[PDB]
Design an enzyme around this catalytic site. Structure first.
Site, mmCIF file in Angstrom:
data_model
loop_
_atom_site.group_PDB
_atom_site.id
_atom_site.type_symbol
_atom_site.label_atom_id
_atom_site.label_comp_id
_atom_site.label_asym_id
_atom_site.label_seq_id
_atom_site.Cartn_x
_atom_site.Cartn_y
_atom_site.Cartn_z
ATOM 1 N N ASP A 183 15.204 -8.439 55.943
ATOM 2 C CA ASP A 183 15.519 -6.866 56.739
ATOM 3 C C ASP A 183 14.243 -6.428 57.242
ATOM 4 O O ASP A 183 13.911 -5.336 57.299
ATOM 5 C CB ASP A 183 16.147 -5.893 55.894
ATOM 6 C CG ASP A 183 17.254 -5.001 56.477
ATOM 7 O OD1 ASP A 183 17.249 -3.968 55.837
ATOM 8 O OD2 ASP A 183 17.124 -5.176 57.674
ATOM 9 N N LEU A 197 12.331 12.489 49.903
ATOM 10 C CA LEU A 197 11.898 11.629 51.120
ATOM 11 C C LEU A 197 13.208 11.024 52.011
ATOM 12 O O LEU A 197 13.085 10.996 53.131
ATOM 13 C CB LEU A 197 10.961 10.432 50.682
ATOM 14 C CG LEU A 197 9.372 10.755 50.383
ATOM 15 C CD1 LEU A 197 8.805 11.009 51.764
ATOM 16 C CD2 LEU A 197 9.350 11.608 49.230
ATOM 17 N N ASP A 253 10.993 -2.571 51.320
ATOM 18 C CA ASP A 253 12.522 -2.423 51.472
ATOM 19 C C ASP A 253 12.935 -0.795 51.223
ATOM 20 O O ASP A 253 12.472 -0.503 50.235
ATOM 21 C CB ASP A 253 13.235 -3.311 50.569
ATOM 22 C CG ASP A 253 14.728 -3.336 50.610
ATOM 23 O OD1 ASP A 253 15.168 -4.016 50.917
ATOM 24 O OD2 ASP A 253 14.985 -2.239 49.855
ATOM 25 N N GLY A 298 21.029 6.282 45.714
ATOM 26 C CA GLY A 298 19.980 6.672 44.895
ATOM 27 C C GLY A 298 19.106 7.298 46.188
ATOM 28 O O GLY A 298 19.560 7.634 47.208
ATOM 29 N N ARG A 357 11.896 0.218 61.056
ATOM 30 C CA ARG A 357 12.366 1.203 60.131
ATOM 31 C C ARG A 357 12.261 0.970 58.577
ATOM 32 O O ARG A 357 12.394 1.502 57.806
ATOM 33 C CB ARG A 357 13.903 1.429 60.239
ATOM 34 C CG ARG A 357 14.808 0.111 59.620
ATOM 35 C CD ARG A 357 16.334 0.341 59.700
ATOM 36 N NE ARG A 357 16.947 -0.887 59.525
ATOM 37 C CZ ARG A 357 17.236 -2.048 60.793
ATOM 38 N NH1 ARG A 357 16.519 -1.646 61.570
ATOM 39 N NH2 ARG A 357 17.707 -2.949 60.309
ATOM 40 N N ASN A 358 11.746 -0.340 58.549
ATOM 41 C CA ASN A 358 11.139 -0.780 57.024
ATOM 42 C C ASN A 358 9.766 -1.257 57.050
ATOM 43 O O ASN A 358 9.190 -1.572 56.146
ATOM 44 C CB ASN A 358 11.878 -2.107 56.778
ATOM 45 C CG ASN A 358 13.099 -1.829 55.851
ATOM 46 O OD1 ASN A 358 13.393 -0.784 55.504
ATOM 47 N ND2 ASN A 358 14.151 -2.751 56.162
#
Ligand code: B49
Ligand code: CL
Ligand code: CL
Length: 338
Positions: A183, A44, A201, A50, A187-188
């Site tokens: 944050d 994804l 996150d 990671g 996009r989160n």
């Protein structure tokens, strides 16, 4: 490293926050899930330390025995402190508990090999990408019943308000647990089947180095355009500064995925303007009312910004009464799941 931070105690002043440390908290081994059962799909999102991988879990859920889920795992290089940060993220998820509007923990593989965090799979991807993909189809204007479903129709102002309400609900749960996101951005925020938004996150799977938004500061990189002034200048993060990020996020939503402060690069004169009291103007699709919400979240005095609970009420009144009915049902179904 993880951005999320849960508040344990505040000094009486209180100029000093004390954040819970995850390693202190105990990992409930109930979450453990046999590794053989899990199947790993295409990746994804890949980053510096990671990746998150699509997958399928068998027998993980009583409600759904064949489930599609997203798995978070460390790279082989696997610096030892990073391995603890992933367990830390796992413990934080366990401590917070579940909510409809966050990417929820489903299980973990910790016993014999690389650590795996199993999480909800969000079919539509991140909100920013989705807005861009459906930009051209946007028209302003039983529409309410369709909103929280997978049915196919052009993106409308009701959808944008639905995303707005759900992110607020998500924060309230987070705020209610004294969790500071630090944050919060489009996009989160992921979208799940049925058009359920889920705050999460992305940090461990995302690489900050390649991402344009993050700006280097003292050996770290900060989402400056989403940060409240107190976070920028004074390095203080609270639920009140998340409310600031939420306002910026609404600008992202009602500009259909535009970049905040368009044409403005983060430099010496940017910081001067934020300190000056500069605020963005109303985006093209923002209703007069939503922009008022953005302005309220951008108050220079943090204590004057509205509470996340308070915001949910404000958005709920901008949405038909049937929508709140539909949300409550999906709320109950989610809680009854498994
Ligand atoms: C739509 C085009 N996209 C590239 C621009 C690829 C399509 N798909 C995507 O982007 C995408 C999708 C559909 N899901 C994710 C990521 C997650 C997801 O779904 N649940 C998660 C839960 C936790 C997490 F950490 C990530 C995800 C992506 C990046
Ligand atoms: Cl709740
Ligand atoms: Cl509810």
């Amino acid at each position: 490293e993880i951005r999320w931070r849960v508040i344990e105690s505040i000094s009486p002043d209180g100029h000093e926050y004390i954040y819970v440390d995850p390693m202190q908290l105990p990992y409930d081994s109930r979450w453990e899930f046999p590794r053989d059962g899990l199947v790993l799909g295409r990746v994804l999102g890949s980053g510096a330390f990671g990746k998150v991988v699509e997958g399928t879990a068998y027998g993980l859920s009583r409600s759904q025995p064949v489930m599609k889920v997203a798995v978070k795992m460390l790279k082989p290089t696997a610096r030892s402190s990073e391995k603890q940060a992933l367990m830390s993220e796992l413990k934080i998820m366990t401590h917070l508990g579940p909510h409809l509007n966050i990417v929820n923990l489903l299980g973990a593989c910790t016993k014999s090999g690389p650590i795996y965090i199993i999480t909800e799979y969000c079919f539509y991807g991140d909100l920013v990408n989705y807005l861009h993909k459906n930009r051209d189809s946007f028209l302003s204007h039983e529409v309410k019943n369709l909103l929280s479903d997978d049915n196919s129709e052009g993106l409308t102002l009701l959808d944008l308000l639905s995303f707005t309400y759900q992110v607020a609900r998500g924060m309230e749960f987070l705020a209610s647990k004294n969790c500071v996101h630090r944050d919060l951005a489009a996009r989160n925020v992921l979208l799940a089947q049925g058009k359920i938004v889920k705050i999460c996150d992305f940090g461990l799977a995302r690489d900050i180095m390649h991402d344009s938004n993050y700006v280097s500061k003292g050996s770290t990189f900060l989402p400056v355009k989403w940060m409240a002034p107190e976070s920028i200048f004074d390095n203080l993060y609270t639920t009140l500064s998340d409310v600031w990020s939420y306002g910026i996020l609404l600008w992202e939503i009602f500009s259909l995925g535009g970049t905040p402060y368009p044409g403005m690069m983060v430099d010496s004169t940017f910081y001067n303007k934020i300190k000056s009291g500069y605020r963005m103007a109303k985006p093209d699709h923002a209703t007069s009312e939503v922009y008022e919400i953005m302005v309220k979240c951008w108050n220079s005095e943090p204590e004057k910004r509205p509470s996340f609970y308070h915001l949910s009420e404000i958005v709920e009144n901008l949405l038909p009464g049937q929508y709140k009915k539909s949300y409550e049902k999906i709320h109950l179904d989610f809680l009854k799941s498994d």
